[PDB]
RNA sequence: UAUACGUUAAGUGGAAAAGGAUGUGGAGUUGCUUAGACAACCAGGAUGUUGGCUUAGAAGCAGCCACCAUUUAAAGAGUGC
RNA sequence: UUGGCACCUCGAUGUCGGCUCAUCGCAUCCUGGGGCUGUAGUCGGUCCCAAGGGUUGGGCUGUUCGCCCAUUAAAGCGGUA
């Protein structure tokens, strides 16, 4: 939570720094108007009265000592460099973003945790390198349809059994919402009643436990984006409004 | 050397080959109008090529007019040379020859009227 | 003077306005006349050239399009490739090959459709297109 | 800057540099090679600088191949110090080089930018070379 | 003028001479000027 | 103030390096070359095309990639300004 | 310069700084003459030739050196036990 929180003071630092440089779309217009105006400008002048190609009139200033070219050529530069700037400033809020979304999701699953998970999720910091110092992937209990629902309260295993414990056809089921688990029965195509129950268990291990107001999202396993880590994306997806349950979600 | 050998022999083949055949500076103008000439002479099918002086004479004798730039144009044409001419008027349209006869400046525009 | 501008699009100031401004004729006139004769697809980027005696007596020719636009245009593609020879990104058919060939024969040096072809050929290998 | 990651001694004599090299006299890694006229100690940072001079110039260029590696370490004593009490402190590496010796190559690349390279290389090095190719 | 033992041409147009026995290098391009010593 | 043969011309001789240079002497290899070379002078030095990508703009020449075809005697999808 | 070695000097070679007195080198601070310039001008930067002459007075500190004040065309770097 130290490093999430950091992270998200990081970026409110960018955010308001970001307001005071943005000057660039006036210096780019400023060149391209100057270098369309290239010929009824004196080298020595203050001003230039310039219409816009709404046709306004704006009054750009300049070098007296420079030519409107060394001008126009400097109004480029600004543009360039203001957009060096925005870009690396934009770089930066993208990765402080994907490592505060990592870490929420995270929580997620260290509230919906067990220590068998957590075991893994320890080494998986410390790989992270935020830390320092072998096939037990998921956990199950009973389901609808006497159906076996497996799920991992780390990141790492849930992956685990995203990608090696299940084929494309079959269905996940996970938050329809920012974070929360990721579960599913082995070929998850068993009935509403089985579809339903799944939406408990997802709920319990969420963002928000006992959340009487929590969608969660069911898509097939064949659009389960495997693109930071548990940056999983989803498509081929459809969501139902559902609610926290009780141990009889086991 | 060889290579020349084989020149000039095929400049005296297409030579004897055709019967009417046409000298003629190519200086004072650009590739444009050059190409242009030789569009409309590639319509007109009379073939026109540049070669140097001294391999077309090893050729011709395998007279005067041979020293300088000089391109020529075969009709197995005097028309659109002399048109071109009047046209661009930075030329020298030295010579002819037709059947092996050496045609003179004006037999050549006599040809082209 | 050349100038690549599309069609229905005369007077997108910034890049046109200069490129009369030294001569300090009627831009917009102008733009509005090469509307009128270029009533074509718009954004058909046109070829036109002009010519300006010294008393303002412009004379303007528009001009088949570029062999790259015709082909963007054939594969329905935005961009040659960038890496072209390394990455080949775009492609169109031999028939395409043959129609904007006899399209642009009025303006070419090759009296040979197939030696145009060979041209446009080379044009492709420099924006990254494959035939078929 | 290279470096022998062990050792026997890190405290030797410095040596003789008499006569001409055994081996390493002709590139055959490569295709055009540097050698040397002249017989004198190399060290790491002149190498690095020759390599980095010469993959500057290249930008992709093919292949390499130094023909050596500093072995040699060489001692120093600290600053404003008498004469004796033990030998002095070990201070880098270097490499004993003969004439007649080949140091870098160079192959997948054209003669001449081969050997413009090995004459920036040479122009960091102390010693007088000669441009070779393989026989 | 540039005087330094290490005298070159620089572009294409830069021609090298002797003079007095020194040498030196001519150009339009007076920066590419140079001289021994 | 020798003989013969050559070398150097810097007072080298009679002080020293990296490096630089149409310095000269001796050889040796090699390309081109009176079917006419090198230099100079005259002329041309073009078309798709402003090659495409990137770029606000990159039009032979900020940079990435490619560097083909046509007129062709030849003109580089370009050597330097 | 800091130093290294111990070669003359321990039957004596007085050692910092300052005063007076100057003198030499030039890798020139000014003055003189030029090249280049990212030298418009005025001022400058850098480099080259030039050692003829000139190259301040005070506060603090024993001081050298240095900082500071005010000037100057400039307030040179060093050798001479």
Same mark, same amino acid.
């Given at each position: 939570?130290?490093?999430?929180?950091?992270?998200?003071?990081?970026?409110?630092?960018?955010?308001?720094?970001?307001?005071?440089?943005?000057?660039?779309?006036?210096?780019?217009?400023?060149?391209?108007?100057?270098?369309?105006?290239?010929?009824?400008?004196?080298?020595?002048?203050?001003?230039?009265?310039?219409?816009?190609?709404?046709?306004?009139?704006?009054?750009?200033?300049?070098?007296?000592?420079?030519?409107?070219?060394?001008?126009?050529?400097?109004?480029?530069?600004?543009?360039?460099?203001?957009?060096?700037?925005?870009?690396? /400033?934009?770089?930066?809020?993208?990765?402080?973003?994907?490592?505060?979304?990592?870490?929420?999701?995270?929580?997620?699953?260290?509230?919906?945790?067990?220590?068998?998970?957590?075991?893994?999720?320890?080494? +998986?910091?410390?790989?992270?390198?935020?830390?320092?110092?072998?096939?037990?992937?998921?956990?199950?209990?009973?389901?609808?349809?006497?159906?076996?629902?497996?799920?991992?309260?780390?990141?790492?295993?849930?992956?685990?059994?995203?990608?090696?414990?299940?084929?494309?056809?079959?269905?996940?089921?996970?938050?329809?919402?920012?974070?929360?688990?990721?579960?599913?029965?082995?070929?998850?195509?068993?009935?509403?009643?089985?579809?339903?129950?799944?939406?408990?268990?997802?709920?319990?291990?969420?963002?928000?436990?006992?959340?009487?107001?929590?969608?969660?999202?069911?898509?097939?396993? @064949?659009?389960?984006?495997?693109?930071?880590?548990?940056?999983?994306?989803?498509?081929?997806?459809?969501?139902?409004?559902?609610?926290?349950?009780?141990?009889?979600?086991? | 050397?060889?290579?020349?050998?084989?020149?000039?022999?095929?400049?005296?083949?297409?030579?004897?080959?055709?019967?009417?055949?046409?000298?003629?500076?190519?200086?004072?103008?650009?590739?444009?109008?050059?190409?242009?000439?030789?569009?409309?002479?590639?319509?007109?099918?009379?073939?026109?090529?540049?070669?140097?002086?001294?391999?077309? @004479?090893?050729?011709?004798?395998?007279?005067?007019?041979?020293?300088?730039?000089?391109?020529?144009?075969?009709?197995?044409?005097?028309?659109?040379?002399?048109?071109?001419?009047? $046209?661009?008027?930075?030329?020298?349209?030295?010579?002819?020859?037709?059947?092996?006869?050496?045609?003179?400046?004006?037999?050549?525009?006599?040809?082209? +009227? | 003077?050349?100038?690549?501008?599309?069609?229905?699009?005369?007077?997108?100031?910034?890049?046109?306005?200069?490129?009369?401004?030294?001569?300090?004729? $009627?831009?917009?006139?102008?733009?509005?006349?090469?509307?009128?004769?270029?009533?074509?697809?718009?954004?058909?980027?046109?070829?036109?050239?002009?010519?300006?005696?010294?008393?303002?007596?412009?004379?303007?020719?528009?001009?088949?399009?570029?062999?790259?636009?015709?082909?963007?245009?054939?594969?329905?593609?935005?961009?040659?490739?960038?890496?072209?020879?390394?990455?080949?990104?775009?492609?169109?058919?031999?028939?395409?090959?043959?129609?904007?060939?006899?399209?642009?024969?009025?303006?070419?040096?090759?009296?040979?459709?197939?030696?145009?072809?060979?041209?446009?050929?080379?044009?492709?290998?420099?924006?990254?297109?494959?035939?078929? | 800057?290279?470096?022998?990651?062990?050792?026997?001694?890190?405290?030797?004599? @410095?040596?003789?540099?008499?006569?001409?090299?055994?081996?390493?006299?002709?590139?055959?890694?490569? +295709?055009?090679?540097?050698?040397?006229?002249?017989?004198?100690?190399?060290?790491?940072?002149?190498?690095?600088?020759?390599?980095?001079?010469?993959?500057?110039?290249?930008?992709?260029?093919?292949?390499?191949?130094?023909?050596?590696?500093?072995?040699?370490?060489?001692?120093?004593?600290?600053?404003?110090?008498?004469?004796?009490?033990?030998?002095?402190?070990?201070?880098?590496? /270097?490499?004993?080089?003969?004439?007649?010796?080949?140091?870098?190559?160079?192959?997948?690349?054209?003669?001449?930018?081969?050997?413009?390279?090995?004459?920036?290389?040479?122009?960091?090095?102390?010693?007088?070379?000669?441009?070779?190719?393989?026989? | 003028?540039?005087?330094?033992?290490?005298?070159?041409?620089?572009?294409?147009?830069?021609?090298?001479?002797?003079?007095?026995?020194?040498?030196?290098?001519?150009? +339009?391009?007076?920066?590419?000027?140079?001289?021994?010593?």
């Amino acid at each position: 939570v130290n490093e999430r929180k950091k992270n998200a003071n990081k970026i409110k630092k960018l955010e308001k720094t970001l307001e005071y440089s943005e000057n660039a779309k006036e210096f780019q217009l400023y060149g391209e108007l100057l270098t369309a105006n290239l010929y009824m400008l004196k080298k020595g002048d203050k001003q230039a009265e310039v219409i816009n190609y709404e046709s306004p009139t704006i009054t750009i200033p300049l070098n007296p000592n420079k030519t409107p070219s060394e001008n126009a050529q400097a109004y480029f530069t600004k543009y360039q460099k203001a957009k060096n700037s925005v870009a690396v /400033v934009e770089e930066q809020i993208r990765l402080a973003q994907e490592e505060i979304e990592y870490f929420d999701q995270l929580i997620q699953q260290l509230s919906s945790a067990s220590p068998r998970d957590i075991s893994e999720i320890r080494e +998986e910091l410390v790989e992270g390198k935020y830390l320092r110092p072998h096939n037990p992937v998921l956990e199950t209990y009973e389901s609808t349809s006497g159906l076996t629902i497996l799920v991992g309260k780390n990141n790492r295993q849930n992956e685990y059994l995203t990608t090696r414990v299940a084929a494309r056809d079959d269905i996940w089921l996970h938050t329809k919402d920012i974070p929360g688990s990721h579960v599913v029965i082995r070929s998850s195509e068993p009935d509403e009643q089985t579809i339903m129950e799944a939406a408990t268990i997802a709920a319990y291990f969420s963002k928000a436990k006992d959340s009487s107001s929590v969608p969660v999202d069911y898509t097939k396993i @064949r659009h389960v984006k495997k693109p930071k880590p548990g940056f999983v994306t989803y498509d081929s997806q459809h969501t139902v409004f559902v609610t926290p349950d009780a141990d009889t979600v086991i | 050397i060889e290579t020349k050998k084989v020149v000039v022999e095929e400049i005296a083949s297409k030579l004897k080959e055709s019967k009417s055949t046409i000298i003629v500076d190519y200086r004072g103008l650009n590739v444009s109008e050059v190409t242009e000439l030789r569009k409309q002479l590639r319509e007109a099918n009379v073939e026109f090529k540049v070669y140097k002086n001294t391999m077309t @004479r090893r050729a011709v004798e395998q007279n005067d007019f041979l020293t300088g730039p000089n391109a020529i144009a075969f009709s197995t044409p005097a028309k659109v040379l002399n048109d071109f001419a009047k $046209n661009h008027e930075a030329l020298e349209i030295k010579a002819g020859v037709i059947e092996g006869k050496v045609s003179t400046v004006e037999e050549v525009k006599a040809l082209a +009227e | 003077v050349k100038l690549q501008i599309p069609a229905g699009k005369a007077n997108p100031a910034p890049p046109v306005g200069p490129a009369l401004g030294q001569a300090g004729v $009627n831009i917009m006139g102008f733009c509005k006349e090469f509307n009128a004769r270029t009533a074509d697809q718009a954004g058909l980027i046109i070829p036109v050239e002009i010519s300006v005696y010294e008393d303002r007596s412009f004379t303007f020719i528009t001009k088949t399009p570029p062999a790259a636009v015709l082909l963007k245009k054939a594969a329905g593609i935005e961009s040659g490739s960038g890496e072209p020879n390394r990455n080949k990104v775009a492609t169109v058919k031999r028939d395409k090959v043959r129609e904007i060939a006899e399209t642009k024969m009025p303006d070419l040096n090759a009296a040979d459709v197939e030696a145009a072809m060979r041209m446009v050929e080379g044009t492709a290998r420099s924006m990254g297109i494959v035939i078929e | 800057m290279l470096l022998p990651k062990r050792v026997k001694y890190r405290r030797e004599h @410095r040596g003789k540099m008499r006569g001409r090299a055994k081996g390493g006299t002709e590139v055959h890694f490569g +295709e055009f090679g540097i050698q040397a006229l002249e017989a004198s100690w190399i060290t790491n940072r002149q190498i690095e600088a020759a390599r980095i001079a010469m993959t500057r110039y290249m930008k992709r260029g093919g292949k390499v191949w130094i023909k050596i590696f500093p072995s040699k370490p060489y001692t120093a004593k600290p600053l404003e110090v008498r004469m004796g009490s033990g030998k002095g402190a070990p201070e880098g590496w /270097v490499a004993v080089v003969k004439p007649g010796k080949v140091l870098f190559e160079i192959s997948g690349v054209s003669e001449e930018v081969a050997r413009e390279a090995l004459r920036l290389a040479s122009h960091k090095l102390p010693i007088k070379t000669k441009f070779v190719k393989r026989e | 003028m540039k005087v330094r033992p290490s005298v070159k041409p620089i572009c294409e147009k830069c021609k090298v001479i002797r003079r007095k026995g020194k040498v030196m290098v001519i150009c +339009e391009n007076p920066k590419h000027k140079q001289k021994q010593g």
